[PDB]
Amino acid sequence: KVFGRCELAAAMKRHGLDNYRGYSLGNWVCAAKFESNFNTQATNRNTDGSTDYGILQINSRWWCNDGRTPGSRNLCNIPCSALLSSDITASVNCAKKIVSDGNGMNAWVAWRNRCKGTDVQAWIRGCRL
């Protein structure tokens, strides 16, 4: 599924991401825009044997199990295929876990490169929440 901006914002709000560990909702929407273009099915297959999965491009070395990645930790305790669902809950639950496991949003390169220091409130402006 390819989400709309405001639709994704509302779904993320319902799942408790606004102000999760001090990150406002617009940060999360921005991260999804630049990681995946809002596409729940996005994959990126890396040359190191890992793959980034879903709307938040969560990587298979530390976070989910795809069976094919060396050094797998599976810290979200999920198959990576769960991150490719139209429902965002598994991605949100794992994203929370990433921050809880002592990462900031710096875990997402696209956030650090394309959202950090920008007006992220723009990404929820005009939306019904």
Side-chain angles (χ1 to χ4, degrees):
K1 172 175 170 169
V2 183
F3 275 83
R5 176 183 62 99
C6 293
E7 291 80 1
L8 184 61
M12 287 179 155
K13 185 171 160 322
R14 285 194 289 276
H15 288 257
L17 285 180
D18 190 24
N19 202 29
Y20 181 79
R21 296 298 299 284
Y23 292 101
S24 64
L25 188 63
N27 284 290
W28 300 99
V29 178
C30 186
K33 170 63 183 179
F34 292 111
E35 287 294 345
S36 67
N37 230 359
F38 301 146
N39 173 11
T40 63
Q41 290 185 123
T43 54
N44 180 52
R45 292 179 188 96
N46 300 305
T47 66
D48 72 353
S50 73
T51 299
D52 309 305
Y53 291 92
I55 202 160
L56 288 167
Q57 290 287 279
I58 291 171
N59 186 264
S60 65
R61 189 182 305 278
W62 288 9
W63 304 110
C64 62
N65 189 8
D66 69 6
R68 300 186 312 284
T69 303
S72 176
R73 303 187 192 192
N74 194 13
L75 297 178
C76 290
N77 197 22
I78 51 165
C80 298
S81 62
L83 300 174
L84 299 176
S85 174
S86 60
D87 188 283
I88 69 168
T89 302
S91 288
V92 169
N93 288 341
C94 185
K96 287 175 175 175
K97 171 68 166 148
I98 293 178
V99 178
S100 297
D101 269 347
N103 303 290
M105 287 194 78
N106 279 315
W108 289 275
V109 63
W111 180 88
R112 188 198 321 162
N113 272 286
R114 311 204 62 182
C115 303
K116 182 185 178 187
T118 74
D119 168 20
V120 291
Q121 295 227 219
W123 285 101
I124 66 170
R125 192 181 299 138
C127 301
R128 283 131 158 237
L129 277 180

